[model samples]
Target: DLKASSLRALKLMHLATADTDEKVIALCHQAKTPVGTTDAIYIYPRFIPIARKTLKEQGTPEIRIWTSTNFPHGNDDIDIALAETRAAIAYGADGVAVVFPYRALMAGNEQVGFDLVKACKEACAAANVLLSVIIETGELKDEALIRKASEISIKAGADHIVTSTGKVAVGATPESARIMMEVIRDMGVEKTVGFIPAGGVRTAEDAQKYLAIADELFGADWADARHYAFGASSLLASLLKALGHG
Candidate 1:
């Protein structure tokens, strides 16, 4: 079905903490795009180089290797996150996803959020790498706060505005995603900034719902890996299963 291929590239197969080198190698092997695997993989900062090398050795060098800074929690100092961004790029990560300073934002310290995102963006821009900011929408339950977070993330120059870290009790939801997408649309950065749903988006069906939100807000043509993505650990298998490859 058209759904399978369209959703395939949008998958950013996430492999978070406590994994072995063999697991990383196995993921690299399973990340080939033409075979209905993911075109990208997100891992901790330490594994960026290995993921890059394994992708190359497996003949899938084109598969994007992304790393996270201040992952699952944006509690680190801005300087530390900035350094992590630089190091991740130097380690061969094509993209860096920074967990936003949501706690500070929730506490009405929007300046801290701005500074953190701006600092990371500065580092990423210099290296010509993509920067994705995770707003952790699940924690920010208020629509107004979600909208504000989305605005700050984009205004600070995010390549993508993601929903969550997938560590919290609640993750991505349609309501939060809609607010984020609307912010992107209203800010007139729909073409430049992406909207991603992480955490709870585990199936092709769930991914479709988020894509539908994007379609309704930004038109169908704007949805793709460049302007949209799904940060998840199990979504790829579900997509493959939908395509009958499982």
Candidate 2:
């Protein structure tokens, strides 16, 4: 169901951290649990092998793995991000996301972002992996920029257009998510460009809010994984508690 798939996450300690290997092992165990097994669990590239191994051993082989590049701030050397994305898939990830170069766009060079997307899309397409273009909406500041960024990501061949990085000062907002939907409508990719209202979405109640939004804008039929997802991690416990799970 869309609800389950939409609750995907990159999880905490977004990138490498102290003893994340142990954390990754813990996360893998949790991901197999009924409460934490949302659509996919995007982990740091280094942890992919451990995560995949754990899931396979646990028999929940269907659990998806997600990886990200140019994180928090999409302001890194393009090749580094590209290398990280490809290496992630090679390491056993099911999908990859690179922040759409919002900083480059904010710096008034939209082509920089476009080129990065084109490169990433090319790699993902060739490798047969999903490439999500995430716009850390918090830094965009202006509504117009957000809309334009969405348009750019679509044109540049993003498999999905995620609302926020969820690691910024301002995470996903209702306004940002709405603008993404409207842009998808205007571009007529309602069924093509996957949508994810990420960042601040937490709790079952919070998850419900984003799902409702996707239903209204993407239509009930088109809102599945083929075109819809959510980025969450911090609140899985609360959501499970709310649902009366252990």
Candidate 3:
């Protein structure tokens, strides 16, 4: 049922023209889908108002706004990252996604990474926004690191842990997703934590398979956005085709 519904939603998204806001709104309403918009902290001040207006105009019922602290480069200091998350949430992001400090993690200074995530969680809590931490599994290169990252993320108060951002050279892989899911399940935090496998997911099959993985490993209870989500850019098209509406 989810496969069919997701596919149909994707078809509608693909068919809607970017410039035709009316058509996009009509299509989304017809599909009964919620739209999400992402943002990086570097551009938060300039983009929050625009995002708020767009969400209103599109009649989007839910919004997950992301701010990449330490971002793709993972260069920002902890204070700056925490401040950015606070500012983004204060501006009205219902959900916040942040990037782990990969540079620090890679250098064996994991405390920096952990502390940064902890600060972000505090900021999210203060703003009453859900927090998602991007693990950047592409940079970790091993299952051990993935597991450790997941553990620290949960301990640091991240509501969810995501795989990648798609801005990197390699995005989410089935192997990575499986490993991350395994780690999360092992952490025994499924009752309260969420998991997202994003980046490079480009097909309906990809989305379905990931969803199926979540269901199979974690059970049907993890099917909702609160428990599991696929971060993607081109998945809607393939989803539409599978739904027989392309």
Candidate 1 lDDT over 1-246, as tens digits, reads 346543553454543322777788777776774454565888877777888888877777777887888877787389878887888888878889998999898887988888899999988888889999998888898999999888998999999998998889899999888899989988899889987788877777887777778878877788777888777776767777676675
Best by lDDT: 1
Q: Identify the leading candidate in terms of TM-score.
A: 1
Higher TM-score: candidate 2 or 3? 2
TM-score of 2: 0.88
What C-alpha lDDT values do all the predictions have? 0.80, 0.73, 0.65
C-alpha displacement of 68 in model 1, angstroms? Answer: 0.8
* Candidate 3 lDDT by residue in tens digits, 190-210: 878877777777777677667
State model 2's lDDT: 0.73
* TM-score, every prediction: 0.92, 0.88, 0.81
lDDT of 1 at 170: 92
Number of colliding residue pairs in each model? 0, 2, 0
Candidate 3 has its poorest 10 consecutive residues by lDDT at 36-45
